[PDB]
Design a protein around this ligand. Sequence first.
Ligand code: NAP
Ligand code: NAP
Lengths: 322, 323, 324, 324, 327, 316
Amino acid sequence: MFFKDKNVLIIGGTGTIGKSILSNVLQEKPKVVRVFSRSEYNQFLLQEEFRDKNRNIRYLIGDIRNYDRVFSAMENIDYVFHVAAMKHVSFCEYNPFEAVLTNIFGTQNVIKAAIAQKVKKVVFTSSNAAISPTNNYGATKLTAERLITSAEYSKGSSETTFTSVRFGNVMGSRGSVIPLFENQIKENQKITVTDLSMSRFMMTLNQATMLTIEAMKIAKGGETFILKMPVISLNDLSEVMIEEVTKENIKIEEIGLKPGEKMYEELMTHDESLQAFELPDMFIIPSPLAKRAKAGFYRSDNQNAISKEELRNLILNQQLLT
Amino acid sequence: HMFFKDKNVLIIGGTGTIGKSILSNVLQEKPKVVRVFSRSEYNQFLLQEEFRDKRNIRYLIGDIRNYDRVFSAMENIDYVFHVAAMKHVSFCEYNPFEAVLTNIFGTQNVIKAAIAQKVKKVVFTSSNAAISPTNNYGATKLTAERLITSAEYSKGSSETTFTSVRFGNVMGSRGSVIPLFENQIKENQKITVTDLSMSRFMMTLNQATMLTIEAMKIAKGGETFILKMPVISLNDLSEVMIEEVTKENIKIEEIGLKPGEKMYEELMTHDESLQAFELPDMFIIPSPTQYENAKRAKAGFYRSDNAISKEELRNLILNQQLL
Amino acid sequence: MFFKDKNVLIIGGTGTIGKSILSNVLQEKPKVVRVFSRSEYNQFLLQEEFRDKNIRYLIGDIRNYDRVFSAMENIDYVFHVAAMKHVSFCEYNPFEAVLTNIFGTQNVIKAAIAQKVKKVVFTSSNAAISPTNNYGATKLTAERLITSAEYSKGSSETTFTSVRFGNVMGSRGSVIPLFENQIKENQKITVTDLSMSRFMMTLNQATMLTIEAMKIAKGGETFILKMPVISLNDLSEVMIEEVTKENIKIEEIGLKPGEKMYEELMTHDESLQAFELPDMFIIPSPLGTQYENAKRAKAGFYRSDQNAISKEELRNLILNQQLL
Amino acid sequence: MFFKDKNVLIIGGTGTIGKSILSNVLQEKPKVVRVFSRSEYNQFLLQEEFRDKNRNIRYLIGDIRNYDRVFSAMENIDYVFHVAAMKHVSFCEYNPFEAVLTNIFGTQNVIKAAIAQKVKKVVFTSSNAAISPTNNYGATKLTAERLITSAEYSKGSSETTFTSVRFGNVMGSRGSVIPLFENQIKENQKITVTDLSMSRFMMTLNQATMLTIEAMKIAKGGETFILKMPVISLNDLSEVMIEEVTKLYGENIKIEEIGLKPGEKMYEELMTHDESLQAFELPDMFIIPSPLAKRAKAGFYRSDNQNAISKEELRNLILNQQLL
Amino acid sequence: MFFKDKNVLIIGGTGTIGKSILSNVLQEKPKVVRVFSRSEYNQFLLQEEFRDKNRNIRYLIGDIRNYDRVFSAMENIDYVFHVAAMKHVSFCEYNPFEAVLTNIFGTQNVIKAAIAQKVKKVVFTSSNAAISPTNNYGATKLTAERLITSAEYSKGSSETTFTSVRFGNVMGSRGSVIPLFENQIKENQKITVTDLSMSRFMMTLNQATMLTIEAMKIAKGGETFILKMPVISLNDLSEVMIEEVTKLYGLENIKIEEIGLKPGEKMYEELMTHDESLQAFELPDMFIIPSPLKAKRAKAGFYRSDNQNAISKEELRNLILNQQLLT
Amino acid sequence: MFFKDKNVLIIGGTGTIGKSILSNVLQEKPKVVRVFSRSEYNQFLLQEEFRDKNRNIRYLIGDIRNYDRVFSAMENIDYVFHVAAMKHVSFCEYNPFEAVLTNIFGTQNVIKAAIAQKVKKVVFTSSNAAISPTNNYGATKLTAERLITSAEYSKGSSETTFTSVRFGNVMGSRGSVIPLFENQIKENQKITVTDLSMSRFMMTLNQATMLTIEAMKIAKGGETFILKMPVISLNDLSEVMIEEVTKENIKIEEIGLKPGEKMYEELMTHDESLQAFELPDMFIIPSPLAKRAKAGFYRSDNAISKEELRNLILNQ
Ligand SMILES: NC(=O)c1ccc[n+]([C@@H]2O[C@H](COP(=O)([O-])OP(=O)(O)OC[C@H]3O[C@@H](n4cnc5c(N)ncnc54)[C@H](OP(=O)(O)O)[C@@H]3O)[C@@H](O)[C@H]2O)c1
Ligand SMILES: NC(=O)c1ccc[n+]([C@@H]2O[C@H](COP(=O)([O-])OP(=O)(O)OC[C@H]3O[C@@H](n4cnc5c(N)ncnc54)[C@H](OP(=O)(O)O)[C@@H]3O)[C@@H](O)[C@H]2O)c1
């Protein structure tokens, strides 16, 4: 229905999530989709993969740090998926200003080009790290989320609607723990662990993709979407993983804790739970500037983690192994 | 006249509550110069006519957003105080990119110019807002804190030293509740109350001033100094204000929460408490070094969530000349 | 009448004249007024002073184009009131004065054209005429910026007018509040050169002059109000007299660097073009517009330099607008 | 030996030539090697590849379009390997301004920042495609080569040294024809072939890696080193690539004519004729001195104008290195 | 005809080709023509030279490195001629980042500004140096040429058209060999010869002017127009120049000093790569190369100045005389 | 003497005064002179003129709106002549912000790059148009002059010292009245006159060259040098010109005032006469942050006669 005959930009289209959004949107036969990123090699690989489907896809090389390039990329465009970002906790500690240029300054650049190019809607892909952040990456997402909600509230005349979406661990994404364990087994027969008492809300690629695309379609403006998500144990994941890659003399090595890392991650602040709504599969938090959700602390701490066996089925079902 | 005697000092943000206090404390120690750096000529004027006889000061108008101006402001300077910021919570939610500019991009400029001009020590003035933040201001100050942390790691060949200092509410500061409620009664016999069940760590002007001067004096880089503080309930504050300002059929309006406001504040994260040192009056969180008789902290949480009494708060206000 | 349900932006609205314009404009029931200034403490206090009375508050620096651009989003009328106004400060920090007064004034013009703003009224000074200091040179360059924009408009409909004041009595960081608070505290007064003279004006006078140009102007004009001349000599005695309610030190501080001994309403060369209303001079751009009640002005100088108002008149002025 | 307890930056250290240069420098026990790349996920892989050798390495995220970030990466550094670029002919024609930012504007940021941080040497990693180019990519290298010679000539009093090295096809390097053909056979069983009569000068990874390190150690500044490389027909390569990839996995496989991509050259050249008139020869190398020991013969050094290798030597070469 | 009552910007109208375009565009009687140049003294001369014709002409001081100023010069303008550049081979090798700013970064500013102001068409003025170049100058012109084609390809929904023209040595144009040799002969009685064996494609000022103006009128967008031009030997040129400059000022026994090549100089020039000659169209007096990114077909082969017969000495002399290239 | 074995940059060295400084400086046999300007064409002409003296001279293309280029141009330089500017009254009126970039914003660039490259002295070339200015150009030189002073006053630790020099009309300079009339007579026989009742202090090319080079050699910092100049009548100039070029049916056209123009020019404000010093052929105005000058207004409001003028012109 929704995207048929429209002009879409996907900023970060070579990344785990951008590629997933591309091909679902492509099924609605859109007039065009434009993939925006910095790295030619990754666009090269993208081009090849879409060999015979490539008529209605276009590949811009650009950096979201550069305004005039965001702007040109945003010409005659209806929908902007803003999915570019520095996502690694450690990299955004060792390089904390670099994290700012991409996540914060890049966001203002995206916002501002969307106002000027009279874009219809913009969907910002945030994280549960933005809640009560222990690290610079999360600080930059909390700032970016403030940037997006401000944009909506001070629009003025603009017809451009601004929205956020909020992820937890997208399972098996670029640089994530699941591929790194799968690799470290096969090659080294040694796993690299931080702290097995750690906790995370996690979610499938499609879960993350559908949230985002549903957001484009339903988004009113100034709101945040948070999917209802299962908690996963880092102990459970390590054992379930070491087992399933074998198809069992692996040495679990304890490396410690990467700078900034949070022991647990939270879907929303308690203060947000006070104004937040509850749908079947998802929460909606309206702009700070129709069913009520239960007030409280939605931590991964507080949730019964799914059991080793329920987790095992989840990995093998979504096929996160090469 | 020990440490600063005949040295060259830059107070960036020196026109303001805390910058002015540092200015007069540092000045007793007989420094060779103190450069006061600030954007607004009205404030430089006012402060300049306050010191008409106290010769030792240069007054530089400029903006920490402009690196070039920060760079020349640091020329031949021994000790920088980075006190400039946007400090209201509400203003950083409604003008959130403006906050990034002053609080983040501005803090880089300090770090980059200090390195380039071979400054001896830089001291950043942060908030307990930067712990487990609920608002853009808090996040910007956490990011700034990490900029200061990283700058100390990446130093390289540089001798320049980067330190943070972390405050809670400096009682009676520019744009704060104690002046507000006072002047709201005076004029409109009305109080604007947000949520009376809020709690804050709060401190005196002198407390924050000496904390910042102490860290400047003894820091080798990487640390974060926190003075331990009385906890203050807003419910008691409202009452004690209505009582003492009258000297009492005064309206109490409930504006409600301003956006992004946090119900309590926190001196440090749980992970920080794991490496924290304890002193009698203070905490020192080191970087990922010995201090005169400091035990290791009690790990755990440091939330304002138990408050000082109403007659204590009365005294604290009255003895401070806050009215 | 004029501002009813229209959209207004006051660049520099926290300040002496900014606030004065703000609330005059608000009386005409305008759809919104956006206040634009940098300093959050000042927006805060003003926010509290308009706690019932429709007003967006934006933090921004005119040195940043992008911020000024979004400030003018969908706006009809703009008041460009922000500058550095101290003479001493613009000599001691001269490049900072270029940034706010010149570069910043571009950003307004450029952004107003960009967002198709209906009218812009620039607040200038007597200082811009035959200037002896950087500030006045910045205001001269501002003025020519504004005139040029109006000429090279092209297809644009944005109109650019200048307004040109003299000392707005009791404005932020000026001598009347200074001397008052100098006596009260120090029993001392800082006097520069007592044979100085100034055209000076009321806060409301300068407010109405600026609201006039908004309503009336077709672009290119520089409006100057006719103004009483005031001796500093007389001001200093009158001040020492009224603030006491006995013996008070009068310190010779001397000239602050760059200061002019007298001020001028227009250049001689402008008097050859100038129009004359009863209480106003309008200088049309060099480039045949009709104003009502207007005859041609008389060629010559318009210096303050002999015909100063009396102490009697002056103390009456200072006492009547409650300036203490 | 040379790099012992030195500080080294590899601008572009994550990709093919950067990684190979890194591990070769590491065997001489330098104090530190820094690695400068934009993409955190490529640094994440490299960082994991050097699991327990890492104490010597630092990982810097940054862009050479950013002077300030290039500058801080150069702090107290002795040796710079400028290896970052857009290197794809197609991408550089469809995004030519991007190519200008990284290949030219970055090269100057490098020059300017090395001068400012008092680096010893900078080796610029250019292509033979900058000679009589038919594309933007080549034009950026020509310009970049021309920036490197200009820095040297007007050094003034800088001790910093500037040199270029000039590769032809580095076999198997990220996003090039050999891994594409293997992959195209594996997944689809089609090879995609532009124009089969194209010829290319091709070198191995270590031929390149050691060209750049030699240059690093030996250069007197303003020079250009190029390695004598064998020619390879694309006729032979495509044939050889199917033969061998089919063997490894399971040769009745399609060949699809694509024709040229925009700006693709038919052959490449190591130096223009003019360069050939003042270049020096060593057994395995040519050295062009600055435009601003044994001397070569003139002529047209092209892939055109030199006998290729045989199918068999080509296959042999491919086997001793890069399949998957 | 075409420019009747239109608005025109000649970015670089103070120079040789920009002035000639100005006066040619002026006879079709447009609403306004704007001149955009950095140098006030050059504008001052032009101003004074157009004593009574100045009324539909405006004089905008400005720099194409400045986007914002390129922007406002283009306001509500219909036809942009981008004729500004550093065009000296030697200068662009010794100041190559300056060449980048003026020749590349400035071309982008034009492109970006022209799209933003909804201009109708733009004609970029390239050189035949862009073909298989041996210098930074020709490096930047290839790149500029490339920016122009890219603009067109991804226009998007912009109606703004982009086209390149492509010149050879424009005779008597500012800072060129002919006024140099004349003046050298006058003032030091000896010329400076790089390398007499060099050959060059050379066109008249009117050939250059008409080429550009035609491409303004005709161009669909993304094409490249090149004029069939005669080859000139520098041997003949140096000889002819000494003869005729002597005949005038009344002096032919004057020194000839071999300087050798300046850095980056090419021996011959080329109108197009061989590759381009396989898609290019021939007209009587002109080739049209279409866009490489998206009616008579020309012959293939290498169109060089060493690969085509010069004019004779005597034809050259006729030319140099009839073009009034002496003073 | 003073410039032997030194490294001199001349910013704007292709134009009237810039060149005059180049060749005088060259007699003192410096190690190097760098000529810095925007225009390749003008450098080209300058390279040809100096063809057999050019080992000493370097030729940089750069715009003083661009810091990094001014900076690199300043590498290892001892003395900087800041002679580049937008100088026409009219061009600075129609193009007012362009004039700010070059005159004001350019000057900050020189100053800031001078401090960084530890340049020994910097001499700024201003105009008496800066006094009580009627035009934007005047506004921008008064602002520039201030910048230079402010740079000296807040140096801090730098050894770089900043100095200004104030010209009136440099006779026969680029784009000026005398070359315009000489050309206008021969080709058209119309002179184009603004207001014949105008007034100007005027000075020889040498005068201004020597003022500037002296300021290099002597200057302590923060001072302005003004040379004692003769006043010339635009009536006397227009006739003297027509007579000598014709050497007289040459019609005179009154075009009127171009925008911004001042009827007279002034060596200093009254306010500066209160602090200025006098010398044989010069005034010295010290930093607002030796013989006293007589106070009063140094307006061009006695002129030199028709005959003294004619001698001045024919003597060059
Ligand atoms: N002449 C030839 O033989 C020849 C052959 C092939 C191609 N071309 C091309 O033809 C074009 C014109 O050649 P031409 O012979 O007429 O050159 P020219 O006489 O030097 O003209 C150059 C023009 O551009 C202006 N300019 C230079 N830099 C500028 C900047 N940054 N911003 C704005 N304006 C600038 C110049 O005036 P100011 O210096 O006053 O700013 C002048 O108006 C050039 O693009 C060149 O590449 C020429
Ligand atoms: N002539 C007088 O009567 C007089 C009177 C008062 C003051 N002055 C002052 O004396 C100085 C020189 O006057 P002049 O007669 O020599 O003028 P001029 O002949 O026009 O010389 C101007 C010089 O500055 C260069 N230039 C212009 N803009 C530039 C920029 N953005 N970046 C770098 N270089 C630039 C010019 O180079 P190009 O080759 O690029 O054009 C040229 O070399 C100026 O500061 C002027 O204001 C002169």
